[PDB]
Amino acid sequence: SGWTFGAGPALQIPFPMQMAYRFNGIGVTQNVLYENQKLIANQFNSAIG
């Protein structure tokens, strides 16, 4: 649900769109995520690993 559950009712949303919102919040346009989605996922999976 993103950050919506901390304010009012929880509202569902697909994870890639939430990640696009999170990128947009730091000054990078969302089209950067979608065109580099798979790669980014890998960099996350390694980071936890």
Binding site: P16, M17, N31, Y34
Partner: protein, 66 residues
């Protein structure tokens, strides 16, 4: 995530793409206020072959009729 009109991907400038079941609109995130997907609401950057989940629809040009 994105709408492909003619070999090009369109992303919302500020808002999300929603659909009632037959047609597509663009709206805000904290309040329901649908609008018509024109060339102002959206910006184009892509090639319509890399986004995962792109859908087919038509955008509207406010200058062609005039």
């Amino acid at each position: 995530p994105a709408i492909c009109h003619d070999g090009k991907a369109h992303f919302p400038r500020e808002g999300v793409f929603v659909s009632n079941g037959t047609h597509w609109f663009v709206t805000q995130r904290n309040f329901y206020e649908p609008q018509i997907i024109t060339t102002d609401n959206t910006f184009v950057s892509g090639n319509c072959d890399v986004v995962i989940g792109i859908v087919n629809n038509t955008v509207y040009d406010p200058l062609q009729p005039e």
